[PDB]
């Protein structure tokens, strides 16, 4: 790397080289500044209202709470030791605070300990195929922790049974041999085994960035620089390029364009429309 001549010697693997024109490397302008852009949403995100819910939904009629217009701090969730598991599928659990999402759904319910494994993509079982089925391409994080002194006493948690044939993903069927009401209650008691203890499960279903996102992580925005090489990060769409004013007319629901190569071609500044 000392000089252009020394580059030619290294490529040619010789201390002397024949006359000619020799390709050696690739010149690249380096980015000078770093730009981070995110929206005003700095209102905090009510994850406490989910994970600290005094009452959780039964598994057959699981409670689907929407999360939007907030700044989600996932480090609080990820680091807390109160969780017996934290299993993400589409993303790495430490990267959550860097991304920004179109919307978030917190599907919360209580299931028996033995079936905690059934809350997973491409699984089947009594709970997974009659109560709460996840799609195979599920994107999100599954969280569970013991509730043996928040739920057990108790027979108020129901789960379906013999008569049915369907579970198609995220369907909530709350409809109520000789006869049998298609629901039987768990016998959650404080004196039973771990496999028989009740488990409070919260599943954060993420919808990947396809629209102007609304739930961003706790990132600090900066100013915007035009006509210069910068490393840019818009709502988690990272890359390197020269940001210029455009003459494109985005539709009000389109966050970003693309090229034929699936590379980003144009973006909408989340703070300046």
């Amino acid at each position, epitope marked *: 790397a000392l000089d252009p001549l020394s580059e030619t010697k290294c490529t040619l693997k010789s201390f002397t080289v024949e006359k000619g024109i020799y390709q050696t490397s690739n010149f690249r302008v380096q980015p000078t500044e770093s730009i981070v852009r995110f929206p005003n949403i700095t209102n905090l995100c009510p994850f406490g209202e989910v994970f600290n819910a*005094t*009452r959780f939904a039964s598994v057959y009629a699981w409670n689907r709470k929407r999360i939007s217009n907030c700044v989600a701090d996932y480090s609080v969730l990820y680091n807390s030791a109160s969780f017996s598991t934290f299993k993400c599928y589409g993303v790495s659990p430490t990267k959550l605070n860097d991304l920004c999402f179109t919307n978030v759904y917190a599907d919360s319910f209580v299931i028996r300990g033995d079936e905690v494994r059934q809350i997973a993509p491409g699984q089947t079982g009594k709970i997974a195929d009659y109560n709460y089925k996840l799609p195979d391409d599920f994107t999100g994080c599954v969280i569970a922790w013991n509730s*043996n*002194n928040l739920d057990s*006493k*108790n027979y108020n948690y129901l789960y379906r049974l013999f008569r049915k044939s369907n579970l198609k993903p995220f369907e909530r069927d709350i409809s109520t041999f000789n006869c049998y009401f298609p629901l039987q209650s768990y016998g959650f008691q*404080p*004196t039973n085994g771990v496999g028989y203890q009740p488990y409070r499960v919260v599943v954060l279903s993420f919808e990947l960035l396809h629209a102007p996102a609304t739930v961003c992580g706790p990132k600090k925005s900066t100013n915007l620089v035009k006509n210069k090489c910068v490393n840019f990060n818009f709502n988690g769409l990272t890359g390197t390029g020269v940001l210029t004013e455009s003459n494109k007319k985005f539709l009000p629901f389109q966050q970003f364009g693309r090229d034929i190569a699936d590379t980003t071609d144009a973006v909408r500044d989340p703070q300046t429309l």
Partner: antibody
Amino acid sequence: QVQLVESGGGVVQPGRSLRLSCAASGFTFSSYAMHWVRQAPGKGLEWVAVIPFDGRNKYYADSVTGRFTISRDNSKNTLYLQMNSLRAEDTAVYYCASSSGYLFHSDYWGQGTLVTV
Amino acid sequence: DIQMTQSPSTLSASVGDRVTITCRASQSISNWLAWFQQKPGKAPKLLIYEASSLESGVPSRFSGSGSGTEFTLTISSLQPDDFATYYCQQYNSYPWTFGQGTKVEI
């Protein structure tokens, strides 16, 4: 049968501390969540604190957050509530309460002990 | 939090009378409410749980009704030992809150 006995009540100067002790008998204390509750003299009673049997979680009323701590030891079948930075408005009779299930049941309420600040 | 309003605050009746106590919830407790009675020098003493279910040792004249936000405590016929204050209590979400109370007078 089932009885909860409170002890440790008395008179405290403002800004000082007091510890309450609570004995349980007649039920499986080691698997029951515990509650503390106080009533001001001829005023409405106020929920104070709760701890599950294994104590991984610990909830408080707002007015006592950061100053009160609840503790238990199933070995001694005893419930405790340590008060610090006591104020005059904390003067109340403090009760122990629990549940065979999920609710304070009248069978599971102590006689109460008075704390005067 | 969850706020709960009792009505009436005070109410005077004679022995044998029909009385109703109304409890007002700021939002759904869907059917998770409790009724308590206290005489002076007495602890809060249970009547009902989930607002319609009878505790052991509780006279059948005591009963409750209601779901969601509007709830009711019932006395069919007054007995002389029912002269006391009555508290509806929610437990849907912590902290557990209590109504202002309703003391029945002679």
